[PDB]
């Protein structure tokens, strides 16, 4: 009080010195019951994936495709998410969620990169510059390798022009390199382009095919379809908490509700358009939202020249959470005697600490409110 009045003496009265506000603790998060589960499992657990000549730009849309199973799948070698770091792939997807796959020969996996041509990046598959998406190369020897070599994935080893990035090049005609015409019967300048990967058990890890899949993420004016899942904690109640349901965020106290939504609303507003109710995406229950307690604190003093005692009023607050409202455990041991004690009184104006209630009645001395006054009788009485 002395510091806010800028004086070394104070006159009898009631002064307002500061405000206070309860603080959030948990910061919970709730999201829908994801359970949408893209059928990537087969294009992880099939025995014969796409073909480098016939690797379809297969459009798999409208489901959640978790990649955390990829990170902990314990098979990857050259799993690389260009554009966005792989660790931040499941959290945030991108539109144009097109998908690709193949079981490539691993001798040139490092050639499959943005801004890098070569042989596979030339005749088989090229990455566009500034790739936004994931190219994943891993060990798939034990299945795509039969006796004497798994010649199940051929490959175009000859192409007239270097591949446009993201082009599934399929053709039957053979490479042209000379001028003397092939007569259909294979000649000295025919050069059958679709050669065969030798995928033998005799091959090493590099020679054996690394399986590479391509989650390509472009930017077209079409709605996004497939993204990684979202985590979500459990929910707390009757505590000033931070919260973020499926899209909207705030801070407050969540309690049981009595109102009744129609089967298609998500939340609710009031006059002046303040959200005050919500529906939890995983239980279909309506919860009411209440602001965390806040208010002002005032000091009742009988005058410096008379005494040196004070009383404290926390306005319109239930007279129980005062030691948590102000960070009492942070204040000095001399503040701490005014956050609890024997003299604790609940009035229509708030919580009064440091004065004792009395059944008698006198003329008003210091106004507190709603018919309640306080004074000094040698001790502060209310």
């Amino acid at each position, epitope marked *: 009080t002395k510091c806010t009045l800028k004086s070394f003496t104070v006159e009898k009265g009631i002064y307002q010195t500061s405000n206070f506000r309860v603080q959030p603790t948990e910061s919970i998060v709730r999201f829908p019951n994801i359970t949408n589960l893209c059928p990537f499992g087969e294009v992880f657990n099939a025995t014969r994936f796409a073909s480098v000549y016939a690797w379809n730009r297969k459009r798999i849309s409208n489901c959640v495709a978790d990649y955390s199973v990829l990170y902990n799948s314990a098979s990857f*070698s*050259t*799993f*690389k*998410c260009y554009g966005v770091s792989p*660790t931040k792939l499941n959290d945030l997807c991108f539109t144009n969620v097109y998908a690709d796959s193949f079981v490539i020969r*691993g001798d040139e*996996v*490092r050639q499959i990169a943005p801004g890098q041509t070569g042989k596979i990046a030339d005749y088989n598959y090229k990455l566009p510059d500034d790739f936004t998406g994931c190219v994943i190369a891993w060990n798939s020897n034990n299945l795509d390798s039969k006796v004497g070599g798994n010649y199940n994935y051929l490959y175009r080893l000859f192409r007239k022009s270097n591949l446009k990035p993201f082009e599934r090049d399929i053709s039957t005609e053979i490479y042209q390199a000379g001028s003397t015409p092939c007569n259909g019967v294979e000649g000295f300048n025919c050069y059958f382009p679709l050669q065969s990967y030798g995928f033998q058990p005799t091959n090493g890890v*590099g020679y054996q095919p690394y399986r590479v899949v391509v989650l390509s993420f472009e930017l077209l004016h079409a709605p996004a379809t497939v993204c990684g899942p979202k985590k979500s904690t459990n929910l707390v109640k009757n505590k000033c908490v931070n919260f973020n349901f499926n899209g909207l965020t705030g801070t407050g106290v969540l309690t049981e509700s009595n109102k009744k939504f129609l089967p298609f609303q998500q939340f609710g507003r009031d006059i002046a358009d303040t959200t005050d109710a919500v529906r939890d995406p995983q239980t279909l229950e309506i919860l009411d939202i209440t602001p965390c307690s806040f208010g002002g604190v005032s000091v009742i003093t009988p005058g410096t020249n008379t005494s040196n005692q004070v009383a404290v009023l926390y306005q319109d607050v239930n007279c129980t959470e005062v030691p948590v409202a102000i960070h009492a455990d942070q204040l000095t041991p001399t503040w701490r005697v005014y956050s609890t004690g024997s003299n604790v009184f609940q009035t229509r104006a708030g919580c009064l600490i440091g004065a004792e209630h009395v059944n008698n009645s006198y003329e008003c001395d210091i106004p507190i409110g709603a018919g309640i006054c306080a004074s000094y009788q040698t001790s502060i009485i209310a």
Partner: nanobody
Amino acid sequence: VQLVESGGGLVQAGGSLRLSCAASGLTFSKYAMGWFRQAPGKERKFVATISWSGDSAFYADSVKGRFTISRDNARNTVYLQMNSLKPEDTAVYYCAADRGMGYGDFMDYWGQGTSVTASS
């Protein structure tokens, strides 16, 4: 080209170690890096990987729980915290770099090898 290792399996008791490598022959912020291991009964088994920028990383199955990686964009150095050593991890570890990252049989340069002996 000047790829060097450090450490040494001097464990007087239960303890850990750190592998400090450095690619002091070429640029350090252009080639993605991986650390591999040689058990006396095994080959240059993959352990850990790390991106060009030192962010993209995903450890092998065996070391995704205890063996931490880190590299620096500058300073040319790189570290692997070999925490809570295991006897199977008594191995000749090679820091190495390549265009890509993660269990590549061929890589640009291999380390000089640190023969860490997790003893009992």
